[PDB]
Design a protein around this ligand. Structure first.
Ligand SMILES: Nc1ncnc2c1ncn2[C@@H]1O[C@H](COP(=O)(O)OP(=O)(O)O)[C@@H](O)[C@H]1O
Lengths: 481, 186, 52
């Protein structure tokens, strides 16, 4: 039964897209928020299809009403909620479902005061006795941004989705859009894809029953502590974290899932920023989190380093068997030039082992890696060499010289010698621990290859997730060679 | 109330709503609205922006100064007046006009040219969609079945918004019509 | 057992007639003179007559 729900939603959003190209992210987000009792906000220049989406989502139901009003600087509350006689609310907002409010950043003082009580309580102060408001979707569009110290920020902090629409840019999607024969006032939604009033009241209760996995909570709490340490990061209130869960739980509900999926965190890119300055900061932190700690991308990186450290620890103990012989070629030159091994080594960032460890830069080291593009220059022209320690940090300078027996003596602050050596051409203990970590990559990749059919996920985000999973898998297959 | 009578051709009336048989919406004024006001919502929705001015020619002013033609009679004959049935049928055949591939190369090029110029006015996506209905209607009443490249001349009064951008829109189209239209500069 | 709520937001252009109730003598049906627990957010921007 839950698997058949994702098919009906995919056919409902397909009929709503017919007529508005390059607006999939602006229509799918409004349909999910309407079925879960959430709001949505739009921003952009007037004329990028902002009022039609408010009149298009009403055809997906069976008892919805439209209300397209423009808030002016001299607007009165009696002209919005209907004039009083006790208030004639015949087709306005208290009895409507999907209302539209354009230029909301300039209404009267009493207009904004009545809108705050109709969101947290879904009621209205209609004279003496109050009544409920069957509001299913709240949308608002404008153009500019409010002040930093004003009363208009009370409503902006309560809206969940902050859509960022813009004009068309693609040429192929503009051909049929320029000459579109589809009417904007008909009923393109079939009668079989429209939900009833009974199914809406039942879905409002099953969303809260979605369980929260322990691995999902590790990503939400980490993002909150990350934005608090950055001064340029925008502040996120506690209400935004609670209202965002209802959106993620509703995305997995209409997609054939019973728990919160880690891929649902992509929708948080339009629920944290507030201006154009913080727009590039929210999309940057989530892109790193979705390609770092989502499917355990960086989690396997800190575990693979312990396997390499354990493998290199057993190779430096038996380094006396295979040393490092440098070829001789001192012909006619002012300095005894050297050269590395030919076909034996071909890597660029190869590592070199040492016998007796030394204390370089007030720390211990067990392996030093050099660059192939930088080793040929020092062994031919001379000068100084720069190499990092333990494969981390920057390429610090070392006191490396040539040996009489064709070796590499590393000098420190105590004038101590250390002959370098290269690792030869896998122990059973390292192979056993490596297969356990490699099997974890296939388990995390199998989860992404099953839930990628979510309709509420953009298409440009799948290119960065797949490129992040292949980068980790390409590094774990190099040490096993 | 004027915004709901354009996109939906309806008007609220207490309880039930009704349609408006509005065929032509004309508006005239003198000054320009503010840059940050609610009056810009109606200006961005109007298609044709006619720029009328006083007479300048001397030959056309002689008969105009002493004109005996009445302005309250019926100079239109009864044989040239269309009926209510022909109006409802013409509203459907306008959308059936095909869009040639050579015409699309000029509309998309004009949109990208105004975006690179900082002094050029901004044109929303609604204006590009509503302008096609005007060009397709010009070729419909002229004996054509497709969008004619010469119909782009009427775009000189559907892009500008003030007196500053009036000389910029009429200059870019004049070069486009005498450059990339019939492959002049091409 | 007989309390009433009143969530109001004070603005820089608020009027006293929109808080206590518009006059006809003042229609104070469910506001502040007959309420018990009222809420006032952003009180540091109200008008001079509201604070008085
Ligand atoms: N980007 C777009 N793609 C397709 N159609 C559009 C687009 N922008 C506007 N339209 C069309 O213009 C008409 C009017 O849009 P409108 O409500 O004025 O947009 P806005 O509310 O952003 O000003 C709509 O019926 C819509 O079909």
């Amino acid at each position: 039964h839950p698997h058949l729900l994702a098919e009906r939603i995919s056919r409902l959003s397909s009929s709503l897209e017919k007529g508005l190209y390059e607006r999939s992210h602006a229509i799918r987000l409004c349909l999910l928020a309407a079925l879960s009792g959430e709001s949505v906000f739009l921003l952009g220049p007037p004329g990028i299809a902002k009022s039609l989406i408010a009149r298009r989502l009403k055809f997906a139901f069976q008892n919805a009403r439209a209300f397209e009003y423009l808030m002016t600087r001299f607007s009165t509350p009696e002209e919005v909620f209907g004039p009083l006689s006790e208030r004639l609310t015949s087709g306005y907002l208290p009895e409507a479902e999907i209302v539209f409010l354009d230029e909301i950043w300039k209404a009267g003082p009493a207009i904004l005061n009545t809108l705050l009580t109709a969101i947290n309580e879904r009621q209205f102060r209609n004279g003496a006795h109050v009544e409920k408001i069957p509001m299913r979707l709240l949308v608002a569009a404008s153009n500019e941004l409010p002040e930093a110290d004003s009363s208009l920020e009370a409503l902006y902090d309560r809206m969940l989705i902050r859509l960022w629409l813009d004009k068309v840019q693609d040429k192929a999607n503009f051909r049929s859009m320029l000459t579109s024969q589809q009417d904007e006032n008909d009923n393109p939604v079939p009668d079989a894809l429209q939900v009833t009033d009974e199914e809406y009241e039942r879905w409002q209760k099953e969303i809260g029953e979605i369980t929260l996995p322990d691995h999902v909570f590790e990503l939400i709490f980490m993002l909150r502590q990350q934005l608090d340490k950055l001064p340029d990061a925008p502040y996120v209130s506690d209400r935004r974290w609670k209202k965002a869960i209802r959106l993620l739980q509703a995305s997995a509900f209409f997609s054939g899932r019973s728990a919160v999926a880690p891929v649902d965190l992509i929708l948080l890119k339009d629920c944290l920023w507030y201006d154009a300055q913080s727009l590039n900061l929210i999309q940057q932190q989530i892109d790193v989190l979705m390609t770092g700690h989502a499917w355990q991308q960086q989690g396997m990186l800190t575990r693979l380093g312990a396997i390499v450290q354990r493998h290199l620890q057993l190779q430096q103990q038996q380094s006396d068997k295979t040393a490092l012989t440098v070829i001789r070629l001192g012909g006619i030159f002012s300095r005894r030039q050297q050269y590395q091994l030919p076909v034996n080594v071909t890597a660029s960032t190869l590592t070199l082992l040492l016998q007796k460890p030394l204390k370089l830069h007030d720390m211990e080291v067990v392996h030093i890696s050099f660059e192939r593009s930088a080793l040929e220059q020092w062994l031919s022209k001379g000068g100084e060499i720069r190499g990092k320690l333990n494969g981390i940090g920057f390429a610090q300078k070392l006191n490396l010289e040539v040996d009489s027996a064709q070796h590499l003596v590393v000098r420190d602050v105590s004038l101590q010698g250390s002959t370098l050596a290269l690792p030869g051409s896998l122990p059973g203990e390292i192979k056993q621990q490596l297969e356990e970590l490699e099997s974890d990559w296939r388990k995390q990749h199998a989860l992404f290859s099953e839930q990628q059919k979510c309709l509420f996920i953009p298409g440009d985000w799948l290119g960065r997730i797949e490129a992040s999973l292949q980068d980790v898998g390409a590094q774990i297959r190099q040490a096993q060679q």
